[model samples]
Target: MSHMRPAFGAAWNRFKEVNVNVEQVGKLLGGKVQHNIDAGIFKNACPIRMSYVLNYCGIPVPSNSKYATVTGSDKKRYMFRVKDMIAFLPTVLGKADISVSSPTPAQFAGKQGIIIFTGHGWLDATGHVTLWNGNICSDDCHFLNGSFIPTNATFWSLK
Candidate 1:
């Protein structure tokens, strides 16, 4: 995995440069979809049909659609807008070799995992989850530097 880092970083940079379609943006933002599958956000629409798109970019699934349709701990189906991937990635990835720690471990440098945060009903209803890069986290990962450091957080390795 160490040898793959440089190549993976390069590919990740390139992947980030690409732009997704508007429908996908809707999917990523959480909204209901039209009969044609084109995502829709209805102000006066029923709340039950709402969806939020985020996360699952690393869930190892074929598409983001499947990841958002998963059943959550609350026994209700959730459509993630990212802050939603923390708990579900392991379920979708089907990998049992997870390394969990509170306050995050310094020894686990260079490892890939998710950081979970619980707060606000905004992007994360139950909680927020983001990838933990060596230094800090990605922009959309949520929380600012040190703001969420001591809060209830969990670090779980992807492997």
Candidate 2:
């Protein structure tokens, strides 16, 4: 029976006993630390989200700032998918500024970017959670550089 009602699953069952506490609001900073610049999480004193967990593991545990560049009208930036992050990362006693790292190229390349987490909310079992909606520095959504420009630009002849 696929009713329109929110889907029920282990997610709700698993977090039944969970108790949410204080909410964390902070900013991520980035900087240069020797040859390896600490631009992402290193810049900000923000604490990693999974650190509090006994043994947490995931793609990039919420820690400092994580950034990803998307081209023109090609790609769209989506919310953090809050529930995914929370479930993926280890849970803290209460609400806290969980810092999760973002996927990047090889070594520390673009670490100068930082993001501010506005806040997150809880919803029914089958809903998506919001990660962040604002930036710590720039007002625009994505950062574009000479590199991000598509090579296909040559295809379009300037009128």
Candidate 3:
């Protein structure tokens, strides 16, 4: 599997640009997400509802955008190490029949092409944006959900 550099350089910079080609942010981030997904803040914050395959990551299943719903008054942005979602399609509903709205890019200011989610809330509660490590969840698929805000935009970090 491809991996991002040891250092958190600019979001899209590369040690070997070839390995991190277009539509590769997910693979870049997926390889480095173990410690963050096990427990504590990472675990608590990323309670994923739907984890679908990313078309750019080179998977088999048809890319489906209808697995999740977006809630909440304010739109939030989430960042992820995107990867093939075909493997985890079974975990979510409507692998080929659902279609939630993708968020606007303006909501993702400052973030390079990181995977962004605009919705929030539990299936029954309030919906919100969730960012997570893509690669770590490729197997069991450790996805993000309610409360997993980006550092710069988190509610507590506002000016």
Candidate 4:
């Protein structure tokens, strides 16, 4: 019957063993990103979250002191806002990944770097920053499905 809770095809499966060695980059950095987030150091912000992950992973970011020390709404040095990162990243990242076309899933997973949205209208302007985690993607809180990202958003990655 539809009201049966335990008579279904499910079991209390808890004995499953999975291999989770430290060979994968996304698996390692994703957890540390969550750590700084849960600790309230970065809070609900995205830019600093990306910044932390990039710095920790030894990934290159904007090095000019101009993009160096940015203060937040709480009056503290947070570093690297998404909009500003957009300007400086292109210089280091070579070129913007997307301008008018949407990134396919393969394109989205191609680089383990930041994906952002910017443009004229609300339909395209997200003013956000997050990462392409080799397979899927993530931000300060958790996993983000790459399919829903805006078509016009810009992506920046190192070669």
TM-score against native, each model: 0.39, 0.16, 0.19, 0.44
Worst 10 residues of 2 by lDDT: 150-159
lDDT of each: 0.38, 0.22, 0.26, 0.42
> What TM-score should be assigned to candidate 2?
0.16
The sequence of per-residue lDDT tens digits that candidate 3 reaches over residues 1-159 is 322211222212322232322223223333223223332213322222112122223222233463222221112222222222222332322222222244332443443222323233344222222222322211121133435322222110001
Runs off by more than 4 Å, candidate 2:
1-7, 20-159
lDDT of 4: 0.42
In order of listing, the candidates' clash counts read: 11, 11, 15, 0
Regions of model 4 farther than 4 Å from truth: 1-44, 59-77, 102-112, 119-126, 140-151, 156-159
Quote model 4's TM-score. Answer: 0.44
Error of 2 at 94 (Å): 27
Sort every candidate by TM-score, greatest first: 4, 1, 3, 2
Q: Per-residue lDDT for 1-159 in model 1, tens only?
A: 121112234323422432234444334334233212342332211111222212223222224553445332223344434433554544544442343433444644676554555544434334444445666553234442324333345554533
Ranking by lDDT: 4, 1, 3, 2
Between prediction 1 and prediction 4, the one with superior lDDT is: 4
The model with the greater TM-score, 1 or 4, is: 4
Query: What is residue 6's positional error in candidate 3, in angstroms?
Result: 6.5
Off by over 4 Å in 1: 1-24, 27-78, 81-84, 94-110, 120-126, 140-150
Which of candidates 3 and 4 reaches a greater TM-score? Answer: 4
For model 4 the local lDDT of residue 81 reads 51
